[PDB]
Amino acid sequence: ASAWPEEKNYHQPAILNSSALRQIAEGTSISEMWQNDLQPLLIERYPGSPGSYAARQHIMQRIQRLQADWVLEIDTFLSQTPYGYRSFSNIISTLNPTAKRHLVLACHYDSKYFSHWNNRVFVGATDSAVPCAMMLELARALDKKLLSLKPDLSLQLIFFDGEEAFLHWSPQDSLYGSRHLAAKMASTPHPPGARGTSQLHGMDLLVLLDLIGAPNPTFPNFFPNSARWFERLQAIEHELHELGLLKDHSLEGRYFQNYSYGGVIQDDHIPFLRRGVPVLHLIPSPFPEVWHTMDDNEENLDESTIDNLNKILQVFVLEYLHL
Amino acid sequence: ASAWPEEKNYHQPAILNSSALRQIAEGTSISEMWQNDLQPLLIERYPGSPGSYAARQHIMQRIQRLQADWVLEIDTFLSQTPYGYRSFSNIISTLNPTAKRHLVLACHYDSKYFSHWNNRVFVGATDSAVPCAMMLELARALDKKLLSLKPDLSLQLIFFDGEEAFLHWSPQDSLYGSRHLAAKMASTPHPPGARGTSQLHGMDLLVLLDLIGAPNPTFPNFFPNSARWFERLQAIEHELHELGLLKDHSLEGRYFQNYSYGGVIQDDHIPFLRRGVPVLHLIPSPFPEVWHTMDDNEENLDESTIDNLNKILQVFVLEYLHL
Amino acid sequence: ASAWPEEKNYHQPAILNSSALRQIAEGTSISEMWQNDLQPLLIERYPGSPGSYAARQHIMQRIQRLQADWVLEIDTFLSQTPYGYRSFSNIISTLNPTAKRHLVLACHYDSKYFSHWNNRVFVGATDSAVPCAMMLELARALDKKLLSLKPDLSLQLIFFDGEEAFLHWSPQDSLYGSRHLAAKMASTPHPPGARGTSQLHGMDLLVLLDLIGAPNPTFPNFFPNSARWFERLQAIEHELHELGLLKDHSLEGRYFQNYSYGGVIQDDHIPFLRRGVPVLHLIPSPFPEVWHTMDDNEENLDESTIDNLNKILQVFVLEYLHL
Amino acid sequence: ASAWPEEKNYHQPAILNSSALRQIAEGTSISEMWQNDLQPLLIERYPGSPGSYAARQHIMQRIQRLQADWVLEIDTFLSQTPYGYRSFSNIISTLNPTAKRHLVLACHYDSKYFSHWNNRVFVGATDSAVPCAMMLELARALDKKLLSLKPDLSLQLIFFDGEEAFLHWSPQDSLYGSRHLAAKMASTPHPPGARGTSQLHGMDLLVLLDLIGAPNPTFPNFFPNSARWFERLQAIEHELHELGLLKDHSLEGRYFQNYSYGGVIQDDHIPFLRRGVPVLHLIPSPFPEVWHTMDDNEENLDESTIDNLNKILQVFVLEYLHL
Amino acid sequence: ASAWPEEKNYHQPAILNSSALRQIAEGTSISEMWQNDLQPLLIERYPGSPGSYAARQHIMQRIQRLQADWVLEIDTFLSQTPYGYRSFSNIISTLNPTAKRHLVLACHYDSKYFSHWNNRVFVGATDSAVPCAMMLELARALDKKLLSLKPDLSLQLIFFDGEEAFLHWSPQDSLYGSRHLAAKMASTPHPPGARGTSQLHGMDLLVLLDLIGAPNPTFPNFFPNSARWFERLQAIEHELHELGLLKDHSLEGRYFQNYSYGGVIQDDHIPFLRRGVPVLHLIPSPFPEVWHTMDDNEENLDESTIDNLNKILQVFVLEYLHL
Numbered sequence A, B, C, D, E: 001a002s003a004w005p006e007e008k009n010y011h012q013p014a015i016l017n018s019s020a021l022r023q024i025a026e027g028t029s030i031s032e033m034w035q036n037d038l039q040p041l042l043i044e045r046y047p048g049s050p051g052s053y054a055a056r057q058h059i060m061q062r063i064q065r066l067q068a069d070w071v072l073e074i075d076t077f078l079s080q081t082p083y084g085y086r087s088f089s090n091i092i093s094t095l096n097p098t099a100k101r102h103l104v105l106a107c108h109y110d111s112k113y114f115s116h117w118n119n120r121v122f123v124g125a126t127d128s129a130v131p132c133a134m135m136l137e138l139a140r141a142l143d144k145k146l147l148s149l150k151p152d153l154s155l156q157l158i159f160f161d162g163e164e165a166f167l168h169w170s171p172q173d174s175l176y177g178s179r180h181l182a183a184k185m186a187s188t189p190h191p192p193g194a195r196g197t198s199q200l201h202g203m204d205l206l207v208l209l210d211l212i213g214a215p216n217p218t219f220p221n222f223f224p225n226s227a228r229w230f231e232r233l234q235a236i237e238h239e240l241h242e243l244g245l246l247k248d249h250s251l252e253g254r255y256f257q258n259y260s261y262g263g264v265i266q267d268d269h270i271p272f273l274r275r276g277v278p279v280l281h282l283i284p285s286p287f288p289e290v291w292h293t294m295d296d297n298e299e300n301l302d303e304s305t306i307d308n309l310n311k312i313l314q315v316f317v318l319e320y321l322h323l
C-alpha cells in the first residue's frame, strides 16, 4: 500500500529557538491548571461511580470550550471483571480525525478502588489526576497554535478508563480501557476507506503520562524505538534550563536521564506496544513514595516540578507537530 | 460485608526498643542452628529421594518439639513431569489456622537433581537448605513469644517441594510445589464458611527466602506493594548495626541496598504474585557464585552473614505480629 | 589541661521523639526568615564597604532582640591584602562564654568583591547570606529552648568576615577573618584561669554552613572525626521525611548522602581543622550553578530546600545540646 | 585598578551554527598534523638536550610559516636542580602586542629524563608531544581566521619547558618553565604602561593540555571557575557528535563527563592557578596506561581520538574568540 | 650513582602458579598469628609508655626467633611535641643491609593517646596492631624462602613510632617517626661509600599497611607510579579467589577495586613520597567505623578478612622478590 505508515520512522522535530521557548514558558500557567483543570479531578473516580461521570464531564467540558476543532468521542463499552460485567468509558479527543497520522498523548482518568478507611478516600493525585490536568493544560496553553491545523499529522488525546485492577493486578484484571481501544483501533481501517492500514498505523507515537506529580522524578528510557524522542526531552529539559525557564531545578536532578531500564512496567501502553506502536512511557522509576496510599493527595504534589514538566512537554509537542 | 482482606495495606509494625533488640540478638544461636537444624538438611534431597523424606521428616520433628501450637500438614500430591508422573509433598506449618490473616515465611526444601560428579553430590546449601534452617531456627528462637498467639493475625510457614526443574527451566518444568499450593489456596474459603474470600486473602505478605548464605548478599527491592516492608529490613539492619549486634558487618556492604531491580526472577512467589499476594522476595542479586554447582556446600557458607540475617528476620517478624 | 577537652569524643545526642520533631518543624517560619533575617543582607558587602557595616548591623539587632543572653563581641582587626591593609570584623555571639565547651555554628558574611556589571551587583545569596539567615533563624526559633542554658556545653554562632578573596584565590588572599580567629582563639586560655587549654579545646564541633540555598544540594561527608555527626544529619533527614515534615522532598534526592569526598574545599574551616578542631562542613558538592555570578540572587533560591535544611539543622542542634 | 581585569567573568562565546561546525571539521587533517607537526617531536628531548633544541626549533618553524602575526619569544632561563643548575627555554607565541586579554593554550614540550633500557628511549608521545602537535595544528587550521586580528582579546600559545622532574617529583624538582613564567608575568605590567595590573590579570583562561592521546580518555571538571567552559566543551562534543563529525565515538564513551574531581593534580597550571588565573586543565583521569613507560609511543596513540579532540578544541577557541 | 636505582622502574614480578599459591595459603595460620603475634600488641602503647616498650620488645623477639637473618636496628630519637620533647624508637629489620635495593613494608606500632574513659582504654587494633602482626606473620610464614637471600634485592620491615598526633593532627604533630627516618635515610649514602645515592634510592617500593582488619575494606589505587603493583594485588586477590583459596569472599566485595582516589591521606608515607619513593598505600577508604574510638578492639576485628589479606600480601612479596 502507500507508505505513509513508515513516515513516523523518519519524522523530525522542528526545533524551536530561544524566543519561541520563552513564549511557551510564559504561556502555560500552573495555577490556572491547578485551580480549573486539576482540583475538580481529585475525587474518588473509579469506574462506575458518580466520580467517573463527573470526571468525564469535566474533561470534555474543559476541552469543549477551546477554539481548536477538537472532536471528543466517548466509547462506552462493557468488560468482564472479577465482580462481573462492569461498564467503562474511554475519552478520545481528536483534532482532524482524517489526519492519517496522529501523535497521541494519553493517561488514565480512573482512580483505583479502595474502601474508605479512617474516613479517607483514595483520589489518586499522581495516579493519575495530575497527568490528566497536564494534558488539559496543554490543550489550553497551545490552543492558538493548535488552531492552525484547520505533513498529514495532528494530535489526539486519550483519557483511558479502568486502568487499575479491581482486586488484584493481573492481566485479567487491569487496563480495561486500553485493551479495548487498542483492539478497536487495530480493527478500524484508517484513513476511512483504506484496505490494509488501521487506526494504529497512524499512531506515530504514543506518549503515556502516568504517575507524574511528585518530587524528584527520573524517567527512564524504556524503548529503543522511541529513544530519539527521549533524547529530545533531554535536550528540551536542558535548554529550558540554560535559559532560565525552569524553577527550583538543577541538572544534577534532571528528570530525563540517560538511564535505560530493565524489565517492563505494565500500563495502558502495553496493548499498543505489542501491536507495534512506538511508545514513550513517561512514568517514573521509582514510583512515587505515595503510590497506592491514601497519601497520594494534593498536599504531596510539587507544583514546581509539574510546572517544569508542563513546559517540557508543551515544547515537545510543538516541535513534533511543527508549530 | 467485611473488608478484612484490606487490613493488610494499613498494617503497621510495632517496632521494638533497644532492650528488645538486644534480647533477640541474644537469644538466637547460629551454632545450635548450624548443628541441630541445618546440618541434617545437607543431603541430596530432590523430590522422590530418600533425602527428601529425611528432610521432610527432620523439618517436622524440629517443629514438633517446640512449645507453640504448630499444625503441620503434608500436602502430598501428584503432578506431571518430563520424566512422567511424580509425587511432591509440601510442608505447611501454621499457627492459629483460623488466624484469618497470616504472615507467611516460606522457602523450598528440595534440592535440585544432579547426577553425581567426581563422587561429588549437589546438596544446595544456599539453594536452599540455609533458608530452611533459618526458618526452623526462627520458630525455635521465637517460641516463647509465639505462644502468645493462644487484629486477628498469626504466622505460618511453608516449605515447598519441587521448586527446581527436573530437566530444564520452564513454566511447565518447575515450581511444582508452589503452583500446586497457590491454586489449592485460591480455592479454599478462608475462613471456614466464608463465601467470597479464599485463603490467599489471608496471606498478608509472603516473605520468601531463596539463595541465602553466601557472602556479601545484596537484596533488591523488587515490588512496590511490599516496599515499605523492605524498608523495614533496611531499618532493622541499621539499628541492629548501630547498636553493635551484628558480626563482621559494615554499612558499606549492607545487604538491603535501596536499589530497584529490573525484571522478575522466577520462583515460588510467582503463583502467588499473579494472584495478588504481596511478596517480599528475599533472594539476592546476583545469585551466589557457587549457584547450581557442587560448591553450593557448607564450606562456602558465611556463618556471620547467616547469623546477621537471622536477627534481622526474627525482628522483622516480631514487629509484624506485634509481639 | 584537664580531661574535659576529650568529652567531645564521647558526646552523644539526646534524640527526639516524634512529638518534639513536630514542634520543631512547626516552630520555624521560612517566611519570617525571608524578610526579617535574609532580605536585609542581600546587599553588596565586601570588607570595609558600607554594606559590611550594615549587614554587620543587621545581624546583631536580630540577635539583640532575642531572649537568650547572647554575648556579642566584635573582632575588628587589620590585615594586608592585595589592595593594601583593610579592616575586617568577625561577629561572635556566645551563650555562656564561661561554658567550657561549645558547639559552634558558623558562616561567612562578607560578599565577594566584584565591580558592577550591567549595573548589577554581586550580593551572594547562597554565598553566604542564606547561611547567615539560617543561623539567625535558628536562634530565633530555638530561643526559648535556649534560655535553659542558664554537662557544660553551650552554643556559639560565628559570622566570619573576609572569607572571600579580594583579587585572586590564594592562601595569602582568602579567609581573612578565620585565620585570625583561629589563631586568636588558639591562644586564649579557656576557661578563664586555665593554664593549658585554649578556646579551641573547648570547641566541640564546628558546623560550617556555606553555599546553601540552591536546589538539589548534596552534602558530602568530608571528615572522619565527624562522620558520626554527619550520620545524625542523615538520620534526622530521614526521620523528618518519614513523618511528613519536609516539603517537596524525596529520598532519592536526599541532601546528605553517604558519599565520601576526596580532596578538600578551602573555606573557613581550614584554620580550625589544622588545629585539630572537628569540622562538619555543610558545603555542597558540586557548588551551585550560580556560584560567583551575578545570578546568585534571590530569584534563584529554593525556599523549600532551605526550610528543610533549617528544620534539620535546628533539630541536629537541639539534640547535640540535649535540649 | 580598572575594570578590564574582570571582563573575563562575563565573556560569552559566539556559538557556531551547523554549517560552520562542518567547515571546521573539514578544516583539520589529522594526517597533515601527524606527519608534519608531531612526528618531528618524537625524540628524546629532555632539557638541555639536543632534542630540546631541535624540538624548540621545529615548533618555531611551523609557526613562522603561518600568515598570522605570531610573535615568538624564547625565554631561556636557569634554575637550580638536583643535578645542579641547568638552562631551560620556554616558547611563547602571541598574537597581538596589546591584546589586553588573551586566551592561552599551553602544553609542555620537554620529555622526562630516562636512561636507556633494552635500547629503548622515552619520547613521551602523549606526555606531552601530542598536545604540542595539537596546538600547532590548531594554529595551522585556524590561520586564515586568526588573521582577522590584524572586545580586545586574542590568543597565545605557550610551550613550557621543564615540566617533568629530573629526579623525583616534588615542588622543588618540577614545573620549571612554568613557575618561572608565572612569576615573571605576575610582575610585568599589562598593558604596557599600566600602574596596577599584570599580564596575569590579562590571562582569561589558561587551557592546559597534558597527557592526551590515549584511547578512551575522560576529562573531569576540575575547577569551578572554569566549569562553564568545561560545559562548553561538552556541548561541543555532543553537537559535533550528533552531526556526524566525530569518528568511532559514542556518547556512551564521551570524553567530557560531568564528573567533578576531589583533589588536585600537580601540573604546569599550578603556578598560574594560585595566582588567580582560571584554568581548564585538559588532563585525563586516569592517566594513560603508558604513563611514564617506554611504551608511551606512537604505536599506542589513538589517531581517532586526536582528530576528534582537534575538532573539539579548535571550535572551543573559535567561539571564545568570537571568530 | 649509575642506573641501578632506575631498576625499580622495570621490575617485573615472578608470578606463582596455582600449585605454589596453594602452599602459601596453606602456609600461614591466622590462629597462630592471632595468638602469638597480635594479642600481645593489644595494649596501650603510645610513645614513651611502658606498653610502647613492651611492644617494642615483642616485635623484636618475634623476628629474632626466626631463621632468616633479620638485622634489627632501633632508631631512637628525641623530638619536640605539644607536651615537650619526648623519645621515640623506630624499629627496622632488614635482610641484606648491603642489598642495594629493598622492597619495604611498614606499619606503625604506636597507639594514639587517650585518657581512660569508663575504665576503657584505647589500644588500636586496626590502627595499627593488625598490620604489625600481619607483617610479623608474614615473616614467620615465609622464613624458609626468605633464607634464600644468603637482582640485588631484598626485604625490609619498618615499624614506625609516633605516627599519631599527640594532641591534634597536624604536620608539626604527627608522623614523628617517618619524618625522622625519611630524612635520615635521604641523607645516608647507600650502598656504603656511594657518592651520590642514598638509602631512599634503594627503596624500590614502600608498602604501607594502615587501618587494616575491619569488615569490608576497599583500598583505592592512590598513586600512578605504584598503580601497576596495585594491579598485581588485584590479580592476586582474584586468582586466590578463583581457586577457592580465600574465605567468605565474593568478587562483589573485592578488597581492591580499580577506583582511583581524589585527595591524599596523610600517613607515614608522606615523608617518602615527597622524596620520590613509590608508595603502595594499603589504607582503606573509608576508614573503619571504629577508627579512633574505643571500639577499635579485638572484639571488632574480622578474622576472615585478615586471613585473606595475609595470603595476598605474602604472595605479593614473593613475586616481587622472585622467590
Ligand SMILES: O=C1Nc2cccc(O)c2/C1=C/c1ccc2[nH]cnc2c1
Pocket (backbone or CB within 6 Å): A127, A164, A165, A169, A210, A211, A265, A266, A267, B223, B224, B225
Ligand atoms: O497496579 C499494580 N498492583 C501491583 C501489585 C504488585 C506489583 C505491581 O507492580 C503492581 C501494580 C502495578 C502498576 C503499574 C502501573 C501503574 N500505573 C498506575 N498504577 C499502576 C500500578
Ligand SMILES: O=C1Nc2cccc(O)c2/C1=C/c1ccc2[nH]cnc2c1
Pocket (backbone or CB within 6 Å): B127, B164, B165, B169, B210, B211, B265, B266, B267
Ligand atoms: O533454575 C534455573 N535454571 C536456569 C537457567 C537459566 C537462567 C535461570 O535463571 C535459571 C534458573 C533460575 C532460578 C531462579 C530462581 C531460583 N531459586 C533457586 N534456584 C533458582 C533458579
Ligand SMILES: O=C1Nc2cccc(O)c2/C1=C/c1ccc2[nH]cnc2c1
Pocket (backbone or CB within 6 Å): C127, C164, C165, C169, C210, C211, C265, C266, C267, D223, D224, D225
Ligand atoms: O573562591 C573561590 N575562587 C576559586 C577559584 C578556583 C577554584 C576554587 O575552588 C575557588 C574558590 C573556592 C571557594 C571555596 C569555598 C567558598 N565558600 C564561599 N565561596 C567559596 C569559594
Ligand SMILES: O=C1Nc2cccc(O)c2/C1=C/c1ccc2[nH]cnc2c1
Pocket (backbone or CB within 6 Å): D127, D164, D165, D169, D210, D211, D265, D266, D267, E223, E224, E225
Ligand atoms: O610526575 C609525576 N611523578 C609522580 C609520582 C607520584 C604521583 C604523581 O602524581 C606523580 C607525577 C604526577 C604528574 C602529573 C602530571 C604530569 N604530566 C606529565 N607528567 C605528569 C606527572
Ligand SMILES: O=C1Nc2cccc(O)c2/C1=C/c1ccc2[nH]cnc2c1
Pocket (backbone or CB within 6 Å): C223, C224, C225, E127, E164, E165, E169, E210, E211, E265, E266, E267
Ligand atoms: O589522625 C587523624 N586525625 C584526623 C582528623 C581529621 C581528619 C583526618 O584525616 C585525621 C587523621 C588522619 C589519619 C590518617 C592515617 C592514620 N592512620 C592511623 N591513624 C590515622 C589517622
Ligand SMILES: [Zn+2]
Pocket (backbone or CB within 6 Å): A112, A127, A164, A292
Ligand atoms: Zn496505580
Ligand SMILES: [Zn+2]
Pocket (backbone or CB within 6 Å): B112, B127, B164, B292
Ligand atoms: Zn536453584
Ligand SMILES: [Zn+2]
Pocket (backbone or CB within 6 Å): C112, C127, C164, C292
Ligand atoms: Zn564564594
Ligand SMILES: [Zn+2]
Pocket (backbone or CB within 6 Å): D112, D127, D164, D292
Ligand atoms: Zn609525565
Ligand SMILES: [Zn+2]
Pocket (backbone or CB within 6 Å): E112, E127, E164, E292
Ligand atoms: Zn589512628
